[PDB]
């Protein structure tokens, strides 16, 4: 099925410029009405920005417009945004999104995942991960709590796993807290049986992009 | 531009309720008939899924509960029976003139049953430790409602503005939350104290509830 995946997010400095891509697959770019893209930024509303219709034609938000550039490339299935002179403002998730040939053309059904971008003067700091060690004896053999801590680190996001995806259940990974280090920090945990504490291995994955970090943290008992 | 007005902007209603959201647009969205009025719902860390399109009509693969109504410059979106499944901010979105703009969207949560937290806390690590830093964590793990109450104690001295505190979204397996609290120190003080405690306070508990732990003792 279709699918648009999007890649170029990250750190920008302030008056920098952003370009992002979104990757189509299992579709021709070149038969989708058109092609958007819309942000969110942290905690806030959606914001359509630009759009590229199928014969080429650009139409831009006047709330951005005049820094703001969208283009296609359909030999690479893919269409791209170009922003400069970026501000805080410009901080945000981007999504790229297909509108319709029909009922108007400009709701959109398809979505990619979204990239965030972070605008800001400080540099990438990649993450410590510490364990949250179960326990030291359990309450009743009942469910035992255990957990990483993934601190320190810029900008966001970070992506916490468990087992390689094989552990999902009774997991909670949290949002991130910004300390007055300027300096994220944040907690996965997950409610596992006791009983098997001693046989099966729980290992958190993290992944910092921005800091090219991976680290897998095996977390046992005490 | 379409400003597009919400309300309410929070909600909360009891797992199976009907749920109405309305939308008002500062100019009509009409166009030769149709009603260029669209719905959204967006679930924590996903992109916008489409339900709604022209004011009334269900998007392909979207349950039959969702529904679309209005014309002008008034719009409702209803949830004939609300799922757990169904927690999400909701946005409005007019498609009738660029730029194409959405309204500021509306929280629903399932309001379930109230359940008490289950309270686990976690010792910094020695790795940690040699950095020079202490993080001590609380964790509060599937209550309801939302509203929960840490409070840290060293040796039994109240501890105020060292630490944060996060909460997840709604858990649509049984409509829960889940806190974590972080107790920040410096190690040199971290090593000065013996008793760390982390009390919680919680409408689902009679009366608050303490997990501690002695430094040095694991």
């Known amino acids: 099925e279709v699918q648009l995946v999007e890649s170029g997010g990250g750190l920008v400095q302030p008056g920098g410029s952003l370009r992002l891509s979104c990757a189509v697959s299992?579709?021709?770019?070149?038969?989708?009405?058109?092609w958007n893209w819309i942000r969110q930024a942290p905690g806030k509303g959606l914001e359509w920005v630009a759009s590229?219709?199928?014969?080429?034609?650009?139409n831009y938000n006047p709330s951005v417009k005049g820094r703001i550039t969208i283009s296609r490339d359909d030999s690479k299935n893919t269409f791209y945004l170009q922003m400069n002179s970026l501000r805080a403002e410009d901080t945000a998730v981007y999504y790229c999104?297909?509108?319709?040939?029909?009922?108007?053309?400009?709701?959109?059904?398809?979505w990619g995942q979204g990239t965030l971008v972070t605008v800001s003067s400080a540099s990438t700091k990649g993450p410590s991960v510490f364990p949250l060690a179960p326990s030291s004896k359990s309450t009743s053999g009942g469910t035992a709590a255990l957990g990483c801590l993934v601190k320190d680190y810029f900008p966001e996001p970070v992506t916490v796993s468990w087992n390689s995806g094989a552990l999902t259940s009774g997991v909670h990974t949290f949002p991130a807290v910004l300390q007055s280090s300027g300096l994220y920090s944040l907690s996965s945990v997950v409610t596992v049986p006791s009983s098997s504490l001693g046989t099966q291995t729980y290992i958190c994955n993290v992944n910092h992009k921005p800091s090219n970090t991976k680290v897998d943290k095996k977390v046992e008992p005490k | 531009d379409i400003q597009l007005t919400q309300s309410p902007s929070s909600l909360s209603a009891s797992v199976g309720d009907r749920v109405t959201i309305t939308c008002r647009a500062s100019?009509?969205?009409?166009?030769?008939?149709?009603?260029?009025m669209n719905w959204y719902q967006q679930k924590p860390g996903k992109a916008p899924k489409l339900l709604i399109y022209a004011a009334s009509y269900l998007e392909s693969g979207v349950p039959s509960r969702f529904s679309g109504s209005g014309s002008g410059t008034d719009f409702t979106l209803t949830i004939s029976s609300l799922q757990p499944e169904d927690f999400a901010t909701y946005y409005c979105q007019q498609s009738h003139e660029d730029p194409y703009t959405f309204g500021q969207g509306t929280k629903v949560e399932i309001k379930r049953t109230v359940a008490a937290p289950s309270v686990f806390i976690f010792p910094p690590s020695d790795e940690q430790l040699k950095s020079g830093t202490a993080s001590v964590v609380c964790l509060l793990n599937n209550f309801y409602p939302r509203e929960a109450k840490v409070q840290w104690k060293v040796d039994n001295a109240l501890q105020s503005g060292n630490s944060q505190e996060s909460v997840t979204e709604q858990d649509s397996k049984d409509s829960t939350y889940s806190l974590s609290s972080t107790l920040t120190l410096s190690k040199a003080d971290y090593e000065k104290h013996k008793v760390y405690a982390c009390e919680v306070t919680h409408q689902g508990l009679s009366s608050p509830v303490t997990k501690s732990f002695n430094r040095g003792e694991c």
């Open positions: 590229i219709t199928y014969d080429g034609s650009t």
């Open positions: 999104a297909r509108g319709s040939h029909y009922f108007g053309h400009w709701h959109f059904a398809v």
């Open positions: 100019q009509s969205v009409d166009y030769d008939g149709d009603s260029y």
């Open positions: 299992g579709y021709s770019i070149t038969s989708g009405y058109s």
